[PDB]
RNA sequence: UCGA
């Protein structure tokens, strides 16, 4: 068992995949760094999900995993799993396949505004979310939103500024409050699979 | 034996007329979805399911009980068929 | 013995010798001659009526046998003796109207110890033949079927040996090339919606009929172009699947004895409900005494008495035709039996029961026993009459009178509910008459004959009769619309002209007779609906 | 409750080297009396392996802890030279009589279900005799005779019977938590909560702050609907 | 060929032809099935707009019994081929989606 | 119209010919190869209608 | 006169082989047979 | 499961008592002893 | 020969057969003829048959009806009911589900109990000598493959339990059901139409006990 | 177990072969085990003659 | 032409008092 | 075992996931259908790949699988798999995860021209490809290319027309010939994982 | 040939 802080990596691309991991607490992102220097979020790892799957088939990790929150993960030895464990791994990998395909669909559905609304609503159902007097909120940066909405920081900031001026959301200190859930739901159109 | 069968035979000169009245009334009830009934909510026939008491699906039972009440009027040439059907469809749509 | 011997079913030793080998499948015997003869045994073979003919070895390895000595028992035989049934403990008395009109009540104990259990095998067959539309093929690949449905089928499409099959299950998979046709516009739209091409072949697989099923014990396949086998012209291959089932005695099955007493099993009571002897022994079968006096077969009664004597003395008897055991000897045997039935109890430190005393009171009131004798003597007097004290298992109180109880030989006949139970909603119709077929094997409907029609007429039930004559038979539009109405929750529509009447009309036309349906104005009415005139 | 014999596909099969057919073997196995010493033991699988010219008895079964065979002299099958009997029988604890068709118990594919006669009590008789207590006559003396198979003791059986009767007599005393799937909650709530190992409001109640919010699907949008539900019922 | 009047049994009570079913005339079940199919088809088509429903009906022969071509349907609505084929395709797609959701018409696929 | 009566009478050759949709000129039934009905035969589709 | 064998049990077939029919080709039909033929003749003793 | 016991009484002279459901055979198993006791062993007064 | 074969002279037969060809006349007349076989009587749908068993616990207007038999006889009604309840998406799926015996769950039996509520079936025994050869009974679903018959009607049917079999019929329409429940019900026919004396009366064991 | 038989009637002969009515008839008909020259004029032989 | 099919009882009509009265008012106002 | 024709579906979204499938021969596409009628290619199933993964975790399929060629598939019962089978399933699912994530990266890397070239080169390494005198070729429609390059048919047709004018490729009858592998390689920049 |  090991705890990781926000922005800390669990493993890096090109490094030996000797260890399989299961997320116990927090939120993890699986990402890739492109030649142009753009960072792209490939998929979201939620509590209970297995990641570092490369250890089951290859010799090295192919993508980089970064903790989005304070995270608690459990290391496991692939060769030491029993029938039940393999069953859990199969089920969870299937679920992650469904969710990554839904994410795929999300990335190509609707304008930037819709993708941003959908991603915010998705994050609202993750350990990245919490709530206070002002209402429900999610702790996320514009850069990460860009990484998970197939866009760049500036455009995301512009659209979020529009949403702030329209009263749908409010933002400060990497922290976004969702003031109008209904409107955001209408903007997103279809929801993104959170489970 | 069917409840009040002797009294039902009493109401008619011929058993077959009783049968016709019951059958036709059952057809009316089925057609209009029981909302034309002369019965009262406490007089409604019940059936025991796993859930509990529900409305009896059998229209013949309904018709026979209704007939036993006396609130129904039966005979020959009481009213033209079309007029009857249309007034019934006006009072109880489909 | 002689019946079994001449029957040839059972196996006997040719000469004197010693038994070399004993197996389920075979018995090897070494005779005096020194020659070693091997006799294979028939195991679970299907007879013409579907009963299982099978031989079981009655000897052990190294046993010394003589000439004509029993080696293996055939079917329905016990130690060389004819066994057509089982020996059961029977009580003669009415029971809650469950014995009404020759009906029979049996104990669940019979099922527990596998009495009246019988093996039955049914033969199924399917042919794959050459057609002008292409070859029929027997395969595991069957269109539009889930893996659940094809589970017990092997690579070739034949059900695996030992698999349990129930109604609806596939025995042998078969596909046949679909006859050419034009798809309805609805089918066009559907095909377009799902984007799936309509398959060339159709599922013609042989399936298990309603009410049947069991364990698959054998599979036989015969192809074309393989050594030793040739089928009729046009037939590529034939597959046979033999399915056997263990049949326990159940409600509706038919039992009978050798004296002509026969009845169907109407009720199977738990052991605690069964009438029982004072020592706790429950009876097996309860037979109604009302069947005896009118039928005048008293042989079953004597068989019951002698069967009681034999039950307690632990012996069997041979009573030849017309020169057999008479009453005095049976009384003697009954006394010898009573000694064991009672003396044992008295030795065990137990005296007469209160209820036995009451029953004895009522018995001397009936003039069955002589007043003034001891309870033991009176019980003996009753036992000599073939009657015993019987306790009601429900109350615990005894029956108010002495009842005849003893061992009876009862057989289970070939008539069983499982074979005879049948029902039909809709199904196959006849070519010419368009009326439902007959028989369970064709999934046919029941015949409503002239006399039944007479009955309906006498009831003055006109719409029921009309249903019988139209909607449930040869009225095509009528039956279609009726089915659709019932599945839609609507009331059934007015029936139309029965097709057999149209057939009648055209057949009368073939005989140069003009049959014209007329209205009240005597104007022609067309029952052929625009179809039969130019 | 079950029988599997090696290389035997069904009950109507026959075993080479063995005199008795499979049906007869199962019939013999029906007479087997098995005593569980451990009250918490509800099922045991006995294994038997034998060969050669020997008559197989109940003793030949491989001994299992807390399992006593009361009738070890019971014959099972006669085996010949080259005859091989390797089988596993499943024996369960139950009540009454359950036919093979009813339980349909199979440890494996080729396993043959067996008619289960659970009741250990073979016979029960009772005698009522006259007795007197000095002043009063016609009094009753009750004697209960019980025959069992040895697995349970007659006294034990009697005690269980009396206990049953008493417990049933208690029934004359009194004269005369919903599924989330049905609650009508959000669809995401339905699917997530359901597949998250719970299906009721009781379990939703069990889910503390560090449980409900831990669920991967659940966040804040869910917590809203949930709260509303807790506002509708209280 | 063999006579339909071939006797079965030693009594004259039964004939061979009496045991031969008619596979030609559709059983009540078939007619019912087809009717339910048409009704479910209309139910599903009531989701679509009037023009794209009329298109499908014209192309698949539900109306007039003949299957109109893209050119004739297009000429009837006065629009270009490619466009009518496009809205036909789109309509069919929406039908696929609604089917995947409701699962209503699957059981009629046999 | 409702059927109230059934009349039976002899049929003239004229009536018989009026019933007829055609004359069967050949003893043939169906073709041994194609299994289709033979033209002008007892099972001809041109006379008694389409299969 | 050639019948499907009745082999429910050995006694069935044994009896079947020893049965005597007055029906069949070259013999009585069912309407032909009156009281005289179906009766038990005195000569049936030890034979039929 | 635990059977329901229902009671329907008319005055002090008459009563009906229903017990359901019960395991097979227990109907008379409970029914018989109660009948015997109620007629014999219930305390009362008489001239 | 075509019109009436055997009418005049030796009947023409097919080669290698003594069997007379069947002409139009033979088709029209006789026991196997059109009139008696297919016109004055017919084979019918919604019918069944089984062995009868005594039912002492039954009421006079009741009979024991096997669940499987009822499942087949009332099959369309059962389909409709399975459509009303959530057991099946539609009728086709329900039928596909009834096709395999192992696909049958326990809720459909409850549905079948709901379907037959208040309705009656007809029991028939051959030979049917009088109108009481057919009677109406309210069916009570029972396990087992046997039909249970009330004792009192045994005399009218001349029925006994030595292996006798009876046929069951389902009146479909409201009119037919009315006719069966009112006119044809066993409890409503207690007296002989011939002598006027009671037909349904105590007999055998009943008389014995009384 | 013990078997007690009653009756004083002594049958001088046992039951005949029960299937002899078939066996002897067909055997006489075929005359297969009889050498052709020693066959009687019966059955198949009689038919040929 | 017997029982429920007899022309005597066949044409018998049934009507509830509510609808019967409604029809009566309808016929009176014409 | 079951054979499927081109454009025929193996299973539909929302339908009972009672059967797990393994592609033996051909090429299968896993796609999602939007209400608006747009079709999007979510992932490519190659011979040896397991699909219908929903059978391992859920009750119904979430996505639609369509055969792009003549295909041979094997049906499997999830509950009847042994250690070895579960191992193969796990490894293969990991491989498909890597490939679907690489596909994710591909969808957001480079302009339409590059994405099209990359997709063509990818298809060149699938059963969708074959070869004759004209050179190596792939049997694929412009619509499918649009579905698998995050664009619509029209623009794809335009770019392909440009490539025809430039001599890089040639097209007829839903059949595209790759004439200059080097040029296409340069246009694509980064290659797409074919296994 | 049965069964009732
Ligand atoms: Mg009888």
TrEMBL record, chain E:
Belongs to the sigma-70 factor family. RpoD/SigA subfamily. It is found in: Cytoplasm. Mg(2+) 11 binds at residues 104, 107. This is RNA polymerase sigma factor SigA. Residues 70-89 bind DNA. Mg(2+) 9 binds at residue 10. Interacts transiently with the RNA polymerase catalytic core. Residues 69-95 form the RNA polymerase sigma-70 domain. The chain holds residues 314 to 423 of 423 of the full protein. Mg(2+) 10 binds at residue 13. Sigma factors are initiation factors that promote the attachment of RNA polymerase to specific initiation sites and are then released. This sigma factor is the primary sigma factor during exponential growth.
């Amino acid at each position: 068992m090991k705890r990781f802080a926000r922005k800390e990596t669990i493993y890096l691309r090109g490094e030996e995949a000797r260890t399989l991991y299961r997320l116990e607490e927090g939120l993890v992102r699986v990402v890739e760094l492109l030649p142009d220097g753009r960072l792209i979020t490939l998929r979201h790892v939620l509590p209970g999900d297995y990641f570092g799957e490369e250890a089951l088939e290859g010799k090295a990790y192919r993508y980089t995993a970064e903790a989005m929150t304070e995270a608690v993960v459990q290391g496991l030895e692939p060769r030491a799993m029993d029938h039940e464990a393999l069953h859990r791994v199969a089920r969870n990998l299937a679920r992650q396949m469904r969710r990554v395909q839904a994410y795929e669909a999300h990335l190509q559905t609707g304008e930037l505004r819709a993708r941003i609304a959908r991603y915010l609503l998705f994050l609202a159902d993750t350990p990245l979310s919490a709530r206070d007097r002002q209402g429900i909120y999610v702790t996320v940066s514009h850069e990460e939103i860009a990484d998970a909405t197939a866009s760049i920081r500036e455009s995301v900031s512009k659209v979020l500024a529009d949403l702030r001026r329209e009263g749908l959301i409010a933002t400060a200190y990497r922290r976004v409050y969702l003031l109008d859930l209904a409107a955001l739901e209408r903007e997103a159109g279809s929801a993104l699979e959170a489970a | 034996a069917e409840p009040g069968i002797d009294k039902l035979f009493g109401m008619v000169d011929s058993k077959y007329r009783l049968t016709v009245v019951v059958a036709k009334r059952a057809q009316q009830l089925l057609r209009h979805g029981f909302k034309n009934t002369v019965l009262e909510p406490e007089e409604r026939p019940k059936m025991q399911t796993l859930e509990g008491l529900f409305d009896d699906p059998n229209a013949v039972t309904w018709a026979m009980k209704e007939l036993l009440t006396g609130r129904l009027v039966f005979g020959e040439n009481l009213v033209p068929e079309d007029r009857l059907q249309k007034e019934m469809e006006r009072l109880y749509p489909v | 013995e002689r019946v079994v011997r001449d029957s040839l079913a059972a196996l006997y030793a040719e000469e004197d010798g010693e038994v070399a080998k004993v197996d389920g499948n075979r018995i090897v015997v070494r005779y005096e001659d020194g020659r070693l003869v091997e006799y294979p045994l028939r195991r679970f073979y299907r007879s013409n009526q579907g009963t299982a003919l099978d031989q079981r070895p009655r000897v052990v390895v190294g046993q010394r046998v003589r000439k004509g000595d029993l080696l293996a028992d055939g079917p329905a035989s016990e130690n060389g003796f004819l066994a057509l049934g089982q020996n059961v403990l029977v009580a003669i008395m009415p029971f809650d109207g469950y014995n009404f009109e020759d009906a029979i009540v049996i104990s669940e104990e019979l099922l527990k110890r596998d009495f009246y259990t019988s093996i039955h095998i049914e033969r199924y067959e399917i042919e794959a033949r050459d057609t002008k539309l292409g070859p029929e093929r027997i395969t595991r690949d069957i269109p539009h079927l889930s893996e659940a449905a094809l589970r017990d089928l092997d690579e070739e499409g034949v059900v695996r040996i030992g698999a349990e099959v129930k109604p609806g299950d596939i025995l042998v998979g078969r596909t046949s090339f679909k006859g050419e046709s034009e798809p309805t516009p609805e089918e066009r739209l559907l095909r377009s919606i799902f984007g799936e091409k309509a398959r060339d072949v159709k599922d013609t697989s042989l399936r298990v009929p309603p009410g049947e099923g069991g364990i698959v014990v054998r599979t036989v396949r015969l192809r074309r172009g393989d050594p030793g086998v040739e089928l009729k012209p046009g037939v590529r291959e034939v597959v046979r699947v033999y399915v056997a089932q263990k049949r326990k005695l159940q409600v509706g099955d038919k039992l009978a004895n050798r004296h002509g007493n026969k009845g169907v099993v109407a009720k199977i009571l738990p052991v605690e409900d069964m009438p029982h002897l004072p020592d706790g022994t429950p009876v097996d079968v309860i037979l109604n005494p009302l069947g005896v006096p009118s039928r005048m077969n008293l042989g079953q009664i004597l068989e019951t008495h002698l069967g009681l004597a034999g039950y307690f003395l632990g012996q069997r008897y041979i009573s030849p035709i017309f020169d057999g055991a008479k009453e005095p000897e049976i009384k003697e045997l009954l006394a010898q039996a009573f000694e064991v039935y009672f003396g044992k109890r008295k030795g065990e430190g137990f005296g007469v029961d209160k209820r036995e005393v009451e029953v004895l009171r009522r018995a001397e009131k009936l003039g069955l026993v002589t007043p003034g004798k001891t309870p033991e003597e009176q019980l003996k007097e009753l036992f000599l009459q073939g009657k015993v004290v019987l306790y009601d298992g429900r109350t615990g109180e005894p029956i108010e009178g002495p009842i005849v109880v003893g061992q009876m030989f009862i057989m289970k006949l070939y008539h069983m509910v499982e074979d005879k139970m049948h029902a039909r909603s809709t199904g196959p119709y006849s070519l010419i008459t368009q009326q439902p077929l007959g028989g369970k094997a064709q999934f046919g409907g029941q015949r409503f004959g002239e006399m039944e029609v007479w009955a309906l007429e006498a009831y003055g039930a006109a719409h029921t009769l009309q249903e019988m004559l139209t909607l449930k038979s040869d009225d095509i539009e009528g039956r279609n619309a009726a089915y659709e109405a019932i599945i839609k929750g609507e009331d059934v529509p007015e029936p139309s002209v029965p097709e057999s009447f149209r057939v009648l009309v055209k057949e009368l036309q073939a005989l140069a007779l003009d049959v014209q349906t007329l209205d009240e104005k005597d104007n022609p009415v067309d029952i052929f609906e625009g179809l039969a005139s130019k | 409750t079950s029988v599997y014999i090696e290389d035997v596909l069904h009950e109507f099969s026959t075993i080479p080297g063995v005199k008795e057919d499979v049906v007869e073997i199962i019939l013999n196995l029906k007479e087997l009396v098995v005593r569980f010493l451990n009250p918490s033991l509800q099922t045991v699988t006995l294994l038997l392996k034998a060969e050669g010219p020997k008559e197989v008895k109940a003793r030949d079964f491989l001994p299992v802890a807390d399992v006593e065979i009361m009738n070890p002299d019971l014959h099972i099958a006669t085996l010949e030279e080259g005859g091989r009997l390797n089988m596993e029988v499943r024996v369960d604890r139950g009540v009454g009589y359950v036919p093979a068709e009813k339980h349909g118990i199979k440890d494996r594919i080729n396993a043959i279900p067996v008619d289960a006669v659970f009741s250990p009590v073979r016979r029960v008789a009772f005698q009522v005799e006259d007795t007197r207590l000095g002043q009063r006559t016609d009094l009753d003396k009750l004697t209960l005779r019980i025959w069992t198979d040895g697995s349970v003791t007659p006294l034990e059986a009697l005690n269980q019977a009396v206990e049953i009767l008493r417990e049933h007599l208690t029934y004359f005393s009194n004269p005369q938590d919903l599924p989330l799937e049905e609650l009508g909650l959000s669809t995401r709530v339905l699917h997530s909560l359901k597949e998250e190992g719970i299906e009721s409001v009781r379990a939703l109640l069990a889910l503390n702050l560090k449980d409900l919010k831990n669920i991967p699907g659940i966040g804040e949008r869910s917590l809203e609907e949930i709260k509303e539900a807790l506002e509708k019922k209280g | 060929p063999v006579s339909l009047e071939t006797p079965i049994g030693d009594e004259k009570d039964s004939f061979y032809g009496d045991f031969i079913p008619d596979e030609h005339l559709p059983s009540p079940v078939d007619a019912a099935t087809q009717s339910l199919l048409s009704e479910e088809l209309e139910k599903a088509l009531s989701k679509l707009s009037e023009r794209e429903a009329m298109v499908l009906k014209l192309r698949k022969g539900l109306i007039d019994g003949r299957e109109h071509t893209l050119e004739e349907v297009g000429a009837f609505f006065g629009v270009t081929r490619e466009r009518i084929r496009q809205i036909e395709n789109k309509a069919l797609r929406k039908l696929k989606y609604h089917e995947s959701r409701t699962r209503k018409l699957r059981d009629f696929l046999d | 119209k409702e059927v109230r009566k059934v009349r039976i009478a002899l049929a003239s050759p004229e009536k018989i010919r009026s019933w007829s949709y055609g004359e069967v000129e050949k003893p043939e039934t169906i073709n041994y190869r194609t299994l289709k009905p033979e033209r002008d035969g007892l099972f001809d589709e041109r006379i008694f209608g389409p299969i | 006169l050639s019948q499907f064998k009745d082999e429910t049990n050995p006694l069935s077939s044994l009896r079947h082989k020893r049965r005597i029919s007055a029906l069949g080709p070259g013999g009585l039909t069912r309407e032909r047979a009156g009281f005289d033929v179906r009766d038990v003749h005195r000569t049936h003793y030890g034979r039929i | 499961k635990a059977p329901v016991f229902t009671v329907r009484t008319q005055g002090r002279e008459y009563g009906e008592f229903v017990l359901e459901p019960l395991e097979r055979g227990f109907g008379v198993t409970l029914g018989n002893p109660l009948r015997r006791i109620l007629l014999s062993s219930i305390p009362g007064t008489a001239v | 020969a075509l019109l009436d074969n055997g009418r005049r002279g030796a009947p023409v037969t097919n080669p290698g057969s003594d069997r007379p060809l069947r002409s139009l006349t033979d088709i029209l007349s006789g026991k196997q003829g059109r009139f008696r076989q297919n016109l004055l009587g017919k084979r019918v749908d919604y019918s069944g048959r089984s062995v009868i068993v005594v039912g002492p616990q039954l009421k006079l207007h009741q009979c024991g009806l096997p669940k499987r038999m009822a499942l087949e006889l009332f099959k369309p009604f059962l389909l409709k009911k399975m459509e009303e309840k959530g057991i099946a998406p539609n009728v086709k799926a329900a039928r596909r589900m009834l096709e395999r015996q192992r696909d049958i769950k326990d809720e459909v039996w409850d549905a079948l109990e709901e379907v037959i509520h208040g309705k009656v079936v007809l029991l028939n025994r051959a030979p049917t000598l009088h109108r009481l050869g057919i009677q109406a009974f309210q069916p009570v679903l029972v396990e087992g493959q046997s039909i249970q018959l009330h004792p009192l009607v045994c005399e009218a049917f001349n029925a006994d339990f030595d292996g006798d079999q009876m046929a069951v019929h389902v009146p479909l329409s409201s009119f037919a059901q009315a006719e069966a429940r009112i006119q044809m019900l066993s409890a409503h026919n207690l007296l002989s139409p011939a002598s006027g004396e009671p037909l349904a009366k105590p007999s055998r064991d009943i008389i014995l006990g009384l | 177990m013990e078997i007690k038989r009653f009756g004083r009637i002594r049958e001088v002969i046992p039951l005949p072969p029960l299937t002899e009515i078939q066996v002897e008839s067909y055997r006489r008909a075929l005359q297969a085990d009889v050498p052709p020259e020693k066959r009687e004029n019966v059955g198949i032989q009689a038919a040929f003659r | 032409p017997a029982g429920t099919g007899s022309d005597f009882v066949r044409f018998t009509q049934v009507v509830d008092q509510k609808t019967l009265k409604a029809i009566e008012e309808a016929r009176k106002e014409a």
